[PDB]
């Protein structure tokens, strides 16, 4: 039970050290966008990010203690939320734009090139704007991302030992809550301000869930239209949600 023994500072260091890299797209700016081509860039990127995410998850404290079936379930439930919070995080310092890749920074007008993407685009922008006005810190971001991984599928997990798995996940979640409060108290916030900011951060996770639900319906729509190429992994992740 390595996750339970970490201090707040050791939790942050572990999560910071596990951060996946920021990947590049194949975007060539010497030609104008199109609906199919732009979405192909984004799905190609998401597929490559997914591989790094799966290996990041192994490094989130407690995740390795779970069964393979339960690791699969949590990632199947959370993967788009996790891609989206990552996107919103690296877009924080780019008001009005989404930084999909260092070489791919789009405003909402270019996102209109895809049908139905503009609503999701606007929601992601609003989330990035909210992180900016809250001045979200990198230490807080990695905590939130790990909360999404452990929380989003846990309520859809029979057995007395089955309760041990959920209870262990909830104890890890509890440890991450401890870690968030630690960071805020170190930043000088009063007790009142700590609880307020904790709530503000966790309430954003409701909006990230919403965006992921909408994005998954849009992904299924792309699959049906069979115009944008979707990778075998993306299709398996998508099918796990339409079960």
């Amino acid at each position: 039970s390595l996750a339970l023994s970490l201090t707040a500072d050791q939790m942050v260091s572990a999560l910071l050290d596990a951060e996946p890299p920021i990947l590049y797209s194949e975007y060539d700016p010497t030609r104008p966008f199109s609906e199919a081509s732009m979405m192909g860039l984004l799905t190609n990127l998401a597929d490559r990010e997914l591989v790094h995410m799966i290996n990041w998850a192994k490094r989130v404290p407690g995740f390795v203690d779970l069964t393979l079936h339960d690791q699969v379930h949590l990632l199947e439930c959370a993967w788009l939320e996790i891609l989206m919070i990552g996107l919103v995080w690296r877009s924080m310092e780019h008001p009005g734009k989404l930084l999909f890749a260092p070489n791919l920074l789009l405003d909402r007008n270019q996102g209109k090139c895809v049908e139905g993407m503009v609503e999701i685009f606007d929601m992601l922008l609003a989330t990035s704007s909210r992180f900016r006005m809250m001045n979200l810190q990198g230490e807080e971001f990695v905590c939130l991302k790990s909360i999404i991984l452990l929380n989003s599928g846990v309520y859809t997990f029979s057995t007395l030992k089955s309760l041990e798995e959920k209870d262990h996940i909830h104890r890890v979640l509890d440890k991450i809550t401890d870690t968030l409060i630690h960071l805020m108290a170190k930043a000088g916030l009063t007790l009142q301000q700590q609880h307020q900011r904790l709530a503000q951060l966790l309430l954003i996770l409701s909006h990230i869930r919403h965006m992921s639900n909408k994005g998954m319906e849009h992904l299924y729509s792309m699959k049906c239209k069979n115009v944008v190429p979707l990778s075998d992994l993306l299709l398996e992740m998508l099918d796990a949600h339409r079960l």
Partner: peptide, 11 residues
């Protein structure tokens, strides 16, 4: 069977 299973397995 799932790719995700394999990537989670792979060492």
């Amino acid at each position: 069977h799932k790719i995700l299973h394999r990537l989670l397995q792979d060492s």
